[PDB]
Ligand binder design. Structure first.
Ligand SMILES: [Cl-]
Ligand SMILES: [Cl-]
Ligand SMILES: [Cl-]
Ligand SMILES: [Cl-]
Ligand SMILES: [Cl-]
Ligand SMILES: [Cl-]
Ligand SMILES: [Cl-]
Ligand SMILES: [Cl-]
Ligand SMILES: [Mg+2]
Ligand SMILES: [Mg+2]
Ligand SMILES: [Mg+2]
Ligand SMILES: [Mg+2]
Ligand SMILES: [Mg+2]
Ligand SMILES: [Mg+2]
Lengths: 250, 250, 250, 250
């Protein structure tokens, strides 16, 4: 089991990429707490993967600062000390910078930027200096590397996550905290939410977008996250792991 | 005059890099409004460069959304339509991600990220489709490219500015708005604020930090900004201009 | 077994990083041919990993164009169609650009650049359109991202490998060849050759070089290569995978 | 005059981008030697810009190592010590990595990579430690950042130039040589050679290629080169200057 003994929090773990991360983490021997905003969805998601000896759902909005210390406490009471934090919760807004309202701006940043900050900051405090082989995996995207004219606030959030993560990685390395911090950058990934938007997959699959001529699937992101959570990646910190069908290569 | 007919807003234009940008912009024929939080400083700064037919100071905090439309109005009443926005206002916090308080986080992002967003969004709206050769110059830094363990929130802000600017550049290009958007990335620059911190310049000048073995001066940033404001750079958009003594090259 | 059915060529597979790649590839079910310039070393290396039903050594200099088609033939006769090419053979010269002789320049490029070109070009021709889940892993380094004043020709070679690999990745993706191409970028890795150079490991382990305060080991590179050779990484192409202890993050 | 007292060699200076660089360098007060392979073209090119007190043509192939020291001698005899080297000579091949012949590979690298190496190495030796404010400007391209499936060898060459230049920049900075080294990265630029290829400009101008919806002109590259040759850019070294209509921003 590649994640033997690991205890992971996966935010936004009830859907899509986060759900697949949680699934493969359990498959590789980790104990997992998945979070999400909606109880019915989250309860169903946890049970689809396993029983409560390996996976539990906690209702939590990643933008909710006070709930973060309670999420660590709940996870530790269930499974023992947290070793792995996957800051995956996020939302998107389909607006250019020009057309973004301040309400849209602040709401998106509250989840995509503050949530990652809260999970990274608290993960460092709670995991440092414990010999855990701890790993913080911050979900950026291709929109952390390149602009999209229709994703202005999303681009801001993903660029922030990209570079903030390097700061955290360096501090943890320099202080011998035994915590690594890295970013994962999905390209387009097929999910029910993509399926719900008529024409989206076909636009994303055009060769001028994704050179492979199709989009990915959630397990494509789960497998790079297994590598980064595992001790196999003990010399990887401060780096960016791109799984995008070639999007950023052209 | 390389900036003949240009009308520029330079935020944080009363000190340091912003002051030098304003100085060289006036030297090259632009009319300039500089902003800053402190009236005595700003009044002295404007008069040090020129008379009110070429430069004026407006007291404005870049984090103040409502003041942005009034700043454009004041500038346009003085000098005619704005052509050039330099989003240079910014603050720094000397904290790791781990040690950043939420108050510090939100305050720094309010200036460094929201201020750039407000100036970029409003610059697009106010300058598009007017044949102005309009240019938005967003001040990132080397901390938009690489982490610094002691500058966590600053790194987040500068990474956000870096990638958000690409979104804006693309939208403006695709829609034929006649607005370019680019980022400038200073390395270490000697200013009175650096001089006020005992030992700072020497730390910044170590070869493991700045390969040139010294730090820069404000005019180093002013001259790349002249290029980007001028029609000489009419094919440059969505790009990052690094002036750092080699910092990021190693 | 994560590499079930895979058949790999690992150039420079008799020492260091390449040897560890070959070792872990065999552990995960691949059949492997390792190459190197020296027969005694290579024979010992292959036997240290396994018997000839899983690993063989072929004497080959990666700069030797004519030997490439014979290497594929030998590998295919042993194990069936090649699925995976790891272009790892390389040499280093300790010279600035200024101090590099033309002889040094051409010799280093003959292995580090031509060898990767030959293996990539021939891997595409020999592996395309066969439903193999084929993967070409080109060994760049941190010196593909950042300069080192003492490694001028090496930097040229590693930058070339970095961007050439993106071209190949795109062509293969656009043409539905079922071949992925990615680069791996080691930081400093402890090997007998590092051990042979008094003071080298300590210089490499300074925090201003490697933030983790130590260097890596060959298996750190082997594990990212397992991921990239495996079908787990079927949506990853044209990307750069950095395993460097934080070197490039600052 | 922004280049007062400068003495420049511009390789491939008889056509296109190089010709415009030479033109604007003369306009800004530099003395210039342009090189090219064809005497009739080069003689006409030099005379189109000015008389022999400001510009001369020397027939030289940048791949010709022995001719480099004679080119510096000829330039110095005419105009005094060389201060500025623009390594702009280059050729292109329209082949994927897969389809590149070894002859094509070696020929393209002989100009695009060896020529830049020869000019950079010799520029350092001939310009260091003379208080010249010396500047080496190495012409990369967007193909130094991103792959193009049809430009495999070109991508290799441009990636090599990109990273080799950082090595040289660092060495020069660390040794206080008073030599800066930077790369310029044109996107698509309208030239007679583009005009000669039916359909090329329209393909290059598609929004999925160049977001601005048109290609650039040679003076777009000349103006960034003026900045980099001038003392205005005295703190810029080891950096990449992209003038591409947004190509790399998406
Ligand atoms: Cl979903
Ligand atoms: Cl706590
Ligand atoms: Cl100041
Ligand atoms: Cl308004
Ligand atoms: Cl070794
Ligand atoms: Cl063959
Ligand atoms: Cl031409
Ligand atoms: Cl000489
Ligand atoms: Mg609209
Ligand atoms: Mg792109
Ligand atoms: Mg502390
Ligand atoms: Mg660095
Ligand atoms: Mg020497
Ligand atoms: Mg063909």
């Amino acid at each position: 089991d590649r994640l033997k003994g690991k205890v992971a929090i996966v935010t936004g773990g009830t859907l899509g990429i986060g759900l697949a991360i949680a699934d493969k983490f359990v498959e590789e021997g980790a104990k997992v707490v998945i979070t999400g905003r909606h109880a019915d969805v989250g309860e169903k998601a946890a049970k689809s993967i396993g029983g409560t000896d390996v996976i539990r759902f906690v209702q939590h909005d990643a933008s909710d600062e006070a709930g973060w210390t309670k999420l660590f406490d709940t996870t530790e009471e269930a499974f023992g000390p947290v070793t792995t934090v996957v800051n995956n919760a996020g939302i998107a807004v389909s607006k250019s910078v020009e057309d973004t309202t301040t309400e849209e701006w602040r709401k998106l940043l509250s989840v995509n930027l503050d949530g990652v900050f809260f999970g990274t900051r608290l993960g460092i405090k709670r995991m440092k200096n414990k010999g855990l082989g701890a790993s913080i995996i911050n979900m950026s995207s291709i929109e952390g590397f390149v602009g999209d004219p229709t994703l202005g606030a999303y681009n801001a959030s993903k660029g922030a996550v990209r570079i903030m993560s390097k700061s955290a990685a360096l501090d943890c390395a320099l202080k011998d905290y035994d915590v690594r911090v890295n970013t994962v950058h999905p390209g387009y990934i097929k999910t029910p939410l993509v399926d719900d938007l008529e024409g989206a997959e076909e636009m994303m699959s055009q060769r001028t977008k994704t050179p492979m001529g199709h989009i990915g699937e959630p397990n494509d992101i789960a497998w790079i996250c297994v590598y980064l959570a595992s001790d196999e990646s003990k010399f990887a910190t401060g780096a960016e792991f791109v799984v995008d069908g070639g999007y950023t290569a052209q």
